[PDB]
A paper describes a structure:
[name] is a cytosolic small protein (68 amino acids) able to chelate Cu by a conserved surface-exposed Cys-X-X-Cys ([name]) motif. Once bound to [name], Cu is delivered to cytoplasmic metal-binding domains of ATP7A and ATP7B (also called Menkes and Wilson disease proteins, respectively), two homologous multi-domain P1B-type ATPases located in the trans-Golgi network, for incorporation into Cu-dependent enzymes.
Numbering used by the authors:
A (entry chain B), B (entry chain A): 2 to 68
The structure:
């Protein structure tokens, strides 16, 4: 499935941090849109797991839905 | 014990995210210095707990020392 998240990133270092935690999770194909504060993740991992992984960063995260 | 870490923060959002993962751990008093990319932490938590907590940001972290 393909999920979209809102993630409050401000600089390219913020985007790098999201990339690093998602790399560490594994089993994801992701695309980070820094100026629109959006992260799109294609994964077999549950929405819960993706959301928990993103919130681990200490950034503000919410769910923009499927597809 | 007062621990000192290097954390590669490059914007104020990077710094706030550090403060939220530390708030989540709890039992910490801290100072985050953005231009010098340093986080000082007074805590009874072990060095390894603090290090692991900071690494959840997805940022590059290293240990500077202890007082
Ligand atoms: Zn940043």
């Amino acid at each position: 499935p393909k999920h979209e998240f809102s993630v409050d990133m401000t600089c390219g270092g913020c985007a790098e941090a999201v990339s690093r935690v998602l790399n560490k999770l594994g089993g994801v194909k992701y695309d980070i849109d820094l100026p629109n504060k959006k992260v799109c993740i294609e994964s077999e991992h549950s929405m819960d797991t993706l959301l928990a992984t993103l919130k681990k960063t200490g950034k503000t995260v919410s769910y923009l839905g499927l597809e």
